[PDB]
Symmetry: C3
């Protein structure tokens, strides 16, 4: 036996239900046009919710029995960010469940919103005390607490009818994104990331697409100048990351590639709005199909790894 | 006697009339709803104006008789920024006086606008020559010449009826803010500030709230998507700074805490617009009351220090 | 004879047809108000096109016979950016030619759009692998592939009737600008540029003005809040650069000053829209006259250098 061993569920694995849940919601937003999309959405949503329940129970066990492992990830100026996946996914599962039970959905949405805001207020701000975060801590994962969590609150609160509160969270996320990205890309240019962190390059896809998806959730799918602007930068980053992909996976394909699923799923979700708004419909179809294929491949890779006993640690 | 001694009025003390003047204007913008607000506004405005006159005379004496002390602050890549408080407050006193004498108000507004634009044009640009500003010069005080001064011109010019000119200054300030903040927050994460500078952390509260207050001044109080976005990031920063407050005041409460008053007063001012627009009225009431209490505490602390002979150097 | 010698046309000389072509387009947009502007526009456009043809042929010769010289500029994390001038100018010549032959214009616009997007996708993204770009590589020239090229595609695609595609390129450029500038200005504050690179300070004038010109091209000249905001920051930078000009030219006037022509020409172009929108007409006239005088001086300086055998290497 081992004196200690890393917990079998890495915190980052919450990216799996994140990607699936967000994709569920994208398909939900096609039911208006193609009713069969609802079936696809419901299946994705149930799968995402089941995985989320499992991973929540797993993390509760980690908290109870391996608390010092949680404490170390929490105080790390790099690893803390993955904890934000927990409230993010809680909110997304709420959004799914709203179709069946708005009361339970609302409870999950508030828990995740309060949770994420408390988390950032405690930890993101603490970094400003200096001396712990280093230049080498400037990782794409920082987008999770700083940006993605706020966008998720924005769209979830809008779903509940709190549009103006949603706009506050939206603004927090959008300005936080624009304020962080400059220093991230400069860091990547000079130093980049070591292979072990490179899959997290996929999170760089997320901001513009998660931003526009949240924006369109609040504004009832009105595809305006801001929405088009966001899509343009989002596609620029997609092209860049496609070119970089062989480098990203230099040391092999791995489960970390779920990092891409936040941007991919939000590409799909926002595409449904562009399509329905009759804006760039051809691009929209491409984006929706591309992102589904990509996430499909992540799912097949993940099943392969599970099949081989190479998923949990 | 002393060969030399620091001048008794630190340049930063212009933050006192700044906070009071801006708060006067917030109360002025409640007269529409509650006429008694005018009395509160007039008292704040008179007090702010009297303090400003005193401090202007004091600084004129510093210029005449201690010019090398001014020169050293001016050429410092850190301390130069506080000089921008002079034209900022000149403009704010003009805005107050407009209620009684638009001619004198207009003169003050132009003096402060020309003054601040000349100041930045001379000094902010000079930094781009390199070799003087250092990484450790990356302080929140830079927001004063770069951001706050432009927003103040924007709203003061709008008051005079020059809305389109006001939008030019508004854009200068808003884009300058977004262009500086990324590097400021990265610096704070890595190095932070020494206790002696930490109260200036309060200036980090200012940008979003000063921005939205200026925006709403130009646009006749129309609370739109941009306004809501700005408030959201503003409240994020408020939460962060509240969490950081014990650290900010690690070495004790001090007069430097007037740094917070620009953001606090602009929180109050913008709240009056949100309230009147029937947007987030409960948040608005909270924000207005909170910021008044906070500034009230600054005033009581300041009276205490004066009472004890611990205000002037 | 020499074993090797730098090619006689520096890649940066494509800034000459850029400035002239963009200025042609500014005058074109005055024909509505003053028909004689068309003659001025046509002359500028023909001159720009002729120079562009020459320089394209020259660069094709460089590619064929001095390929390793191109390869070295391409792989440089600093010098690669000037290559973007080639597709940028290709697009601008297309915009000119559209007045006479929309078919040929469309071909040039697509070639330049595909070319610039391929170029950035290959090279700008590659920088994110780290270890090649250094802090000292943080130069204004980076705006050429990252920002200017996207804005040029935006307005050229709008000219062809592809407004929504144009908005995608517009957003890519605008967000890329805001994401790069923070780190550029911090670098200039700390380290600046050596005299040999200082003329490229002129490119700092470009972003806001090129941005607003592209925006107004897409949106049919509607001078709205965004347009005014952009002009305000653009003029701030103009003032800063005017103050810095003696420093910029410390070691003498040189052909590198064509770096300013992208911002100058776009100042002129956007002024035509402000004027026609009856927004800040006096500022507009000033801006249009100023930028024409400036570019006129660049032309006279260039003729002088050609006259003296000091243009080509
Ligand atoms: C998702 C939940 C993450 C929470 C991690 C909490 C980190 C706790 O932090 C610790 O709390 C201890 C008390 O229990 C204190 O003794 C320590 O000072 C502090 O490190
Ligand atoms: C997803 C929601 C997680 C919130 C739980 C965090 C509670 C931990 O406790 C808090 O953590 C601090 C964080 O910097 C520690 O310094 C202190 O113990 C305390 O402030
Ligand atoms: C960081 C990039 C932010 C860009 C924000 C774009 C400014 C908003 O764009 C606005 O869109 C409106 C609706 O489409 C139009 O009516 C306005 O004319 C336009 O200015
Ligand atoms: C977000 C993108 C998902 C929507 C995919 C819709 C694909 C349907 O395809 C479209 O069907 C239309 C009739 O309904 C036809 O007029 C179009 O030619 C066809 O492209
Ligand atoms: C609010 C006003 C601040 C102005 C500070 C001015 C700094 C002056 O600067 C100095 O000017 C001198 C001449 O008087 C020159 O001898 C010096 O070179 C220069 O340092
Ligand atoms: C609030 C308005 C203050 C403007 C006064 C500044 C005048 C000082 O004089 C100017 O100052 C320069 C600034 O870099 C010095 O280098 C030079 O003396 C001169 O340019
Ligand atoms: C840095 C963050 C900048 C965000 C700017 C928000 C873009 C403007 O937002 C615009 O607001 C208008 C009025 O409410 C709406 O009519 C438009 O639909 C919306 O795009
Ligand atoms: C910017 C916030 C300052 C405005 C404070 C207004 C507080 C008044 O209070 C409000 O009065 C209303 C009637 O006038 C009632 O309908 C509301 O229930 C009550 O909250
Ligand atoms: C405007 C056009 C610029 C293109 C520059 C291309 C840089 C080419 O790059 C080179 O390509 C070679 C093959 O020809 C390879 O041998 C090299 O690995 C690679 O350096
Ligand atoms: C203006 C349009 C120029 C596009 C031509 C570039 C083609 C060069 O070839 C490409 O260049 C790479 C760039 O990083 C090299 O690494 C590889 O050869 C290849 O990817
Ligand atoms: C980086 C700076 C981005 C600023 C974008 C400004 C947000 C858009 O500004 C919008 O302009 C519209 C048309 O004029 C107005 O109708 C809206 O009220 C206003 O919010
Ligand atoms: C982009 C700026 C270029 C336009 C320059 C136009 C200058 C014309 O000048 C204007 O002519 C008007 C009548 O046409 C008069 O009413 C105005 O007084 C005069 O300033």
């Amino acid at each position: 036996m081992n004196i200690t061993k890393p917990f079998p569920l890495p915190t980052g694995y919450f990216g799996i239900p994140l990607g699936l849940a967000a994709l569920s919601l994208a398909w939900f937003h096609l039911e208006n046009l193609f009713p069969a999309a609802r079936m696809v959405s419901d299946v994705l949503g149930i799968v995402a919710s089941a995985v989320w329940i499992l991973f929540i129970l797993m993390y509760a066990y980690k908290l109870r029995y391996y608390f010092e492992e949680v404490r170390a990830e929490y105080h790390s100026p790099v690893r803390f960010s993955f904890i934000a996946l927990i409230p993010i996914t809680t909110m997304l599962v709420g959004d799914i469940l709203y179709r069946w039970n708005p009361l339970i959905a609302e409870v999950l949405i508030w828990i995740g919103t309060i949770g994420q805001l408390l988390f950032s207020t405690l930890r993101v701000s603490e970094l400003w005390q200096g001396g712990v975060f280093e230049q080498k801590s400037t990782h794409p994962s920082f987008y999770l607490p700083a940006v993605a969590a706020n966008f998720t609150s924005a769209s979830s609160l809008a779903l509940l009818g709190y549009h103006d509160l949603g706009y506050l969270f939206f603004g927090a996320g959008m300005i936080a994104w624009i304020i962080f990205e400059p220093v991230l890309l400069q860091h990547l240019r000079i130093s980049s990331l070591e292979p072990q962190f490179r899959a997290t390059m996929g999170i760089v896809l997320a901001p513009a697409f998660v931003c526009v998806s949240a924006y369109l959730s609040i504004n009832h799918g009105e595809v305006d100048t801001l929405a088009k602007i966001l899509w343009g930068y989002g596609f620029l980053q997609l092209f860049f990351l496609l070119r970089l992909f062989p480098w990203i996976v230099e040391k092999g394909l791995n489960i970390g590639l779920w990092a891409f699923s936040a941007g991919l799923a939000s590409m799909a979700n926002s595409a449904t709005a562009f399509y329905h708004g009759n804006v760039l419909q051809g691009v929209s179809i491409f984006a929706f199909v591309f992102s589904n294929v990509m996430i499909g491949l992540l799912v097949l890779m993940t099943i392969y790894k599970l099949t081989k006993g190479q998923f949990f640690l």
